[PDB]
Amino acid sequence: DIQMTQSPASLSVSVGETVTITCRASENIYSNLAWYQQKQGKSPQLLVYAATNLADGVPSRFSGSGSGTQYSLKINSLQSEDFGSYYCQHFWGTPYTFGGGTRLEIKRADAAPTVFIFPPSDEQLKSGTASVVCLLNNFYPREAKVQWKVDNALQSGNSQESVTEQDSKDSTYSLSSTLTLSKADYEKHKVYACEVTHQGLSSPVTKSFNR
Amino acid sequence: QVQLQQSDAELVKPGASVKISCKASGYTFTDHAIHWAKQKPEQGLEWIGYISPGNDDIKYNEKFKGKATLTADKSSSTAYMQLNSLTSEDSAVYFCKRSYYGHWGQGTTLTVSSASTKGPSVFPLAPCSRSTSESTAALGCLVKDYFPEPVTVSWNSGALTSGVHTFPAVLQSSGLYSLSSVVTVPSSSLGTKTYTCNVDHKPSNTKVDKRV
């Protein structure tokens, strides 16, 4: 059992810059190391086999470095689709261990959410539960905060958010926040309010509907 | 050229055993080890082992002798892994492979639970009025209350890529999932196109095509 250690763990680095992800073997793999990039619900892809050899479709902007125990992936004109997790795996001496992974978010300058609010669809109301969804579309960084006001009661506790992978192209996120209420509680209030804060917005924007 | 088709997702009962196929295509099966790996939700992968079809050499990562049994059938080019005495920790994506440095298969998602399978309810998301913000309208489907993962959303029966965003599924209070898939169009277009979201939940053969 020979453990690979990856460093760093996370990397937020601007397009055009040059990244260096290192991976140290606990003892000596003899340049039998593969690097992989995995994106978000998919199969890993081969970047470099045999500790420096480029895999068939990989761009030239990637190079494998290393020997003995310190191996390195270097991406040099980092681009928008170079985000994702990178993993190194050693193939000498079973068990063939995986490193801890590196998640790379390619950095962007700020962008403000464009916020939409969706009322509970009647088909849903007629099933006893009513979900109010709020959408912050195409923003950056990922940290946005959504506050629901159901009348002018600050709902704390009854909402869940989920966020996309950064986009391959513009490098921006999007986020949904679903608020869930019994048919009862939604029919006993009129204003539903999605209020979004985000550095990038000058002053918090709030979207709302009535019924 | 090298294609490895895995089984679709399986929901399996605790203490039971599941059996995942890896149907190898477009190369001769018998001279290449198939390796297995398990990656949990938001973590690393670890190596299960390999079954070289041909000289039937198998070697297991020590933490998995016992829970998996790699096996191959030399004639339909299918390697198999069986996971015994399934338990919650065994819920993960399991992957197969072509060599040392090879092509990965798609991933099979194992949910190991006690719960029953529920195919989804597809709700619509459409705004209360136009000029909601900019000249951009958003529409979506709410794929609410399904189990187990995964659901696949596609707009206009695959013909609509420009502007869709399908969120990671979320696990609600009830123990079933929810997921929204929204699309942004410009406002001009409310009439220019018909919006259809096709929701697929293969663990319960539920196939819906909603229109918005």
Expressed as residue numbers, the domain containing A74 is 1-108
By Cβ distance, the residue of B44, B101, B127 closest to A116 is: B127
- Identify which of B134, B149, B146, B210 has the alpha carbon closest to the alpha carbon of residue B176: B146
Scan for tokens 């978010």, then name that residue: A105
Domain stop point among A87, A108, A129: A108
Do both A164 and A96 map to the same domain? no
Residue ranges of domains in chain B, CATH in brackets: 2-114 (2.60.40.10), 115-212 (2.60.40.10)
Residues paired with B81 in a beta bridge: B20, B70
Interface membership of A1 toward B (CB under 8 Å) = yes
End-to-end Cα separation, chain B, in angstroms: 40
First to last CA, chain A: 62
How close does chain B come to A105, measured CA to CA in Å? 15
- In this structure, the answer to whether residues A158 and A201 fall within a common structural domain is yes
Count of residues making up chain B? 212
For residue B63, give the DSSP letter.
Answer: G
SS3 B62: helix
> Which pair of tokens denotes residue B203?
């663990």
Beta-carbon contacts of B142 under 8 Å, excluding residues fewer than 6 positions away, are A121, A124, A131, A133, A178, B122, B123, B124, B125, B178, B179, B180
CB–CB of B95 and A209 under 8 A? no
- Clarify whether residues A95 and A122 are in a common domain: no
Q: What is the 3-state secondary structure (H, E, C) of chain B?
A: CCEEEECCCEEECCCCCEEEEEEEECCCHHHCCEEEEEECCCCCEEEEEEEECCCCEEEECHHHECCEEEEEECCCCEEEEEECCCCHHHCEEEEEECCCCCCECCCEEEEECCCCCECCEEEEECCCCCCCCCCEEEEEEEEEEEECCCCEEEEHHHCECCCEEECCCEECCCCCEEEEEEEEEEHHHCCCCCCEEEEEEHHHCEEEEEEC
Half-sphere exposure of A82 (CA within 13 A, CB side): 27
Gap between the Cα atoms of A118 and B128, Å rounded? 7
DSSP β-ladder status, B108-112 and B10-12:
parallel
Q: Answer for the pair A100, B94: CB distance below 8 angstroms, yes or no.
A: no
CATH number, position A40? 2.60.40.10
| Whether A18 and A102 share a structural domain | yes
Q: In chain A, how many domains are there? A: 2
Burial B31-49 (b: 16+ CB within 10 A, else e): ebbbbbbbbeeeebbbbbb
Same domain for A29 and A104: yes
DSSP letters for A19-52: EEEEEEESS---S-EEEEEE-SSS--EEEEETTT
Q: What is residue B90's three-state secondary structure?
A: helix
Which pair of tokens denotes residue B148? 């187990």
Which residue type is seen at A154?
L
Q: Same domain, yes or no, for A171 and A91?
A: no
> Are residues A44 and A127 located together in one domain of the fold?
no
- Among A62, A93, A59, CA closest to A75: A62
Q: How far apart are alpha carbons B96 and B88 in whole angstroms?
A: 21
A118–B140: do the CB atoms touch at under 8 Å?
Answer: yes
Q: Would an 8 Å CB–CB cutoff place A56 in contact with chain B? A: no
Our CA-based measurement puts residue A17 at a distance from the nearest CA of chain B, in whole angstroms, of: 26
**A148 and A184 in a common domain:** yes
Same domain, A104 and A134: no
Residues 6+ apart with CB under 8 A from A34: A46, A47, A48, A49, A50, A88, A89, A91, B100, B101
Cis, bond preceding A204 (omega within 30 deg of 0): no
Three-class DSSP category at B199: strand
Tokens of A38: 């995995």
Domain shared by A73 and A164, yes or no: no
Q: After which residues is chain B broken (C to N over 2.5 A)?
A: none
Q: Is A21 left (phi over 0), alpha (psi -120 to 50) or beta?
A: beta
A98 and A135, same structural domain?
A: no
Cβ proximity of A83 and A101 under 8 Å = no
Q: Other CB atoms closer than 10 Å to residue B2's CB: what's the count? A: 13
Nearest-angstrom CA–CA distance, A174 and B181 = 11
